[PDB]
Amino acid sequence: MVLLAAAVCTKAGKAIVSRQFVEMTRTRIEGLLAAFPKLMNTGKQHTFVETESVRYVYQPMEKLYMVLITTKNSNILEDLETLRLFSRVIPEYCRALEENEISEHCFDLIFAFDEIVALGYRENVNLAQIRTFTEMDSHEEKVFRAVRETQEREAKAEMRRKAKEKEVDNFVDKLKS
Amino acid sequence: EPPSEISLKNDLEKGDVKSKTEALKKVIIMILNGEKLPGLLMTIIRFVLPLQDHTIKKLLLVFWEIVPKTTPDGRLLHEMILVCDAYRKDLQHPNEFIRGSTLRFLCKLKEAELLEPLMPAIRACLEHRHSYVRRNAVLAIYTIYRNFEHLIPDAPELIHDFLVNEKDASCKRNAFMMLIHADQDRALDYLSTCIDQVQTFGDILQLVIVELIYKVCHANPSERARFIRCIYNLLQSSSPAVKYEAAGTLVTLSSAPTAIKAAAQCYIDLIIKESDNNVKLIVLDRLVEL
Amino acid sequence: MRILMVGLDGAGKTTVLYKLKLGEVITTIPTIGFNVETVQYKNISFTVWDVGGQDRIRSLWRHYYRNTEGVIFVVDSNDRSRIGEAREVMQRMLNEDELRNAAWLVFANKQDLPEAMSAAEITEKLGLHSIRNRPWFIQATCATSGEGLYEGLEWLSNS
């Protein structure tokens, strides 16, 4: 993990959608987080705030915020890419932007979190390709036609049966000393 | 006397899957509250072992996952073993994505009577030429290691040998992450091996070692040279990530005036290069510590 | 129709099934659970629960207590063991009323596989001789044999 939740946010004091990598507690962790986020703490601007060693990572994208959270150190850029990246992905994933579309393609969207990121690891590239992996496959089909068919033959037949029946060193020395 | 639970039931017929989808969403929302009162279980039960609807299964499944399962019925609703056999098959499924997806789920999953021969089952699935599937096992296993590590007991080595068989960086990266959590030692042995090779390689896996090494010294040291030999190589350092860590780890390790200088430089340039201010501040903070 | 294959499945009770379904054989671990197939005839598509009569699974089938429409009893005709005992159980099916909504078939399977009883011998023995408020013609299979089955069945859906 490098993120116990990704929650995609809309301005509302409320985060439009979320997923809980790990359950234990109740929303109050998440619920409390939601509250704080909605409040924004009046704070003016800035796309990042970490407070109390918790990264609250966000990106306004419009009236929307996409949010990630973490507490101990990270390499920034990567991160950014993601926020941004989210901001690339959605109109594809759930269709454009307005909660509803997403409301219909919730399943798709959550699926995307997992898919995209396996526990804080940047899994791939290529969205379409990303579609590919599941509920879009190939193997299963290959297998099915042949198999189904084979069985079918047995069945058909059955129908009848039925039917009828240097450098290092510089350092090293210095140090060594 | 009658209820809309039933109203949903006919819809499902009416559409098939489609209607059911709707039902899932509703159910979901209903579920979302907590809320539901049972009975549809039966329906679900009835149609689903004989039905496909993959997506739906995925919805279903997930639903099961998020929702409880040690349900006041048991534990299980009590069928947690029987239905699974199809699923086990799916899990068996020659069909690799399908297994992988399951696996993904499975990493989320943790339902034991079902697991046991699925332990066998999984083992087979590891062999499948797909790194996606195999990788998925790495999470899954991780999931075991806390829940019922023991379930499998021979693993840390088994993995470690596995690594030997292995060569997909993605999977490797993972492999490390888990491996040290099981036991560092194996990683280390390998570490010894890898020492020269590292430089050639992709970062992500490299990172993970940096954490590990840290904890052990405060507890105890005497280990250096072998490391050093490498470490110096690491004093190439060049990705912004690498560099970011690389100076950071160094300080962790050392603070010799020479050390002080080395890291310092890295920063200074970095900064200079640097653009995201947020970042800039951060290092200060470290610095502030320093 | 809901058609029921019970007894402990893994014996090739399941074989019996897999043989129907793909032509194949038990290439599963011996199977406690629901095994499902739909077989279409009179286009009543018979949904077969091949379910082990192993402990829980026998014990617990209440959601499957609903209303029957077809009976296969898949038989170890080398079993001549749990059948009296079975008879003793079987009564409670008899004592079920859902259970009286099927014109059926007991299938004697596993004939080659060791031997079998008098078609009659069994008939009393499971307590089978005694019915009528459901039809009750008898049909032997084996699990490496069985034909004319379908005569049995023919009458049966067309009851």
- The Cα of A91 is separated from the nearest Cα of chain C by a number of Å equal to 41
Cβ pairs A/C, distance under 8 A:
19
- Could you please report the per-residue DSSP string of chain B? ---HHHHHHHHHHHSSHHHHHHHHHHHHHHHHHS---SSHHHHHHHHHTT---HHHHHHHHHHHHHS-SS-TTSSSSS-TTTTHHHHHHHHH-S-HHHHHHHHHHHHH---HHHHHHHHHHHHHHHTSS-HHHHHHHHHHHHHHHHHHTTTS-SHHHHHHHHHHH---HHHHHHHHHHHHHH-HHHHHHHHHHHTTGGGGS-HHHHHHHHHHHHHHHHH----HHHHHHHHHHHSS--SHHHHHHHHHHHHHH---HHHHHHHHHHHHHHHHH---HHHHHHHHHHHHH-
Q: Would you say B55 and B18 are in contact if contact means Cβ atoms under 8 Å apart?
A: no
CA–CA distance, B285 with B279 (Å, rounded to integer): 10
3-state class (DSSP) for residue C34: coil
Contact between C34 and C50 under an 8 Å Cβ cutoff? The reply is yes
Cβ-proximal residues to C40 (8 Å cutoff; 6+ apart), any chain = C46
Q: Which residues of C109-148 are buried (b: 16+ CB within 10 A; e: fewer)?
A: bbbebeebbeeeebbebbbbeeeeebebebbbbbbeebee
Helix (H, G, I), strand (E, B) or coil at A164: helix
Beta strands in chain C (DSSP E): 2-6, 36-41, 44-50, 70-74, 105-108, 139-140
B278 touches chain A (CB under 8 A): yes
Helix (H, G, I), strand (E, B) or coil at C49: strand
Per CB-CB distance under 8 Å, the chain A contacts of C22 are 150-151, 154
Length of chain B: 290
Chain A CB contacts of B262 under 8 Å are 171
* Whether C21 contacts chain A with CB within 8 A: yes
- The type of residue at C97 is D
Residues 6+ apart with CB under 8 A from C85: none
- Measured in residues, chain A has a length of 177
From CA C117, how far away is CA C77, in angstroms rounded? 7
Asked if A78 contacts A85 with a C-beta cutoff of 8 angstroms, the reply is: no
Q: Which candidate in C40, C54, C91, C139 is catalytic? A: C54
Check A174 against B94: CB less than 8 A apart: no
The tokens for B88 are: 């086990």
What angle (nearest 5°) sits at the alpha carbon of residue C138, between those of residues C133 and C143?
Answer: 135
Q: Is B281 on the interface with A (CB under 8 A)?
A: no
Cα–Cα distance measured from residue B50 to residue B64, given in angstroms and rounded to the nearest whole number: 18
Interior/surface letters C24-49, b for 16+ CB within 10 angstroms, e for the rest: eebebeebbbbbbbebeeeeeebbbb
H or E stretch including C28? none
Q: Report yes or no: B81 at the C interface, CB cutoff 8 Å.
A: yes
- Check CB contact under 8 Å for C41 and A150: no
State which H helix or E strand residue C141 sits in: none
CA dihedral B149, B150, B151, B155 (to 10 degrees): 70
Residue pair C1/C47 in contact by the 8 Å Cβ criterion: yes
Q: Which residues of B31-53 are buried (b: 16+ CB within 10 A; e: fewer)?
A: eeeeeeeeebeebbbbbbbbeeb
Whole-number Å distance between alpha carbons of A105 and A109: 6
Look-up of token digits 């598509």: C45
Q: Is C139 a catalytic residue?
A: no
Distance from CA of C149 to the nearest CA of A (A): 7
Tokens of B65: 């996952």
Chain C closest-CA separation from residue A160 CA (Å): 11
Experimental technique of record: cryo-EM
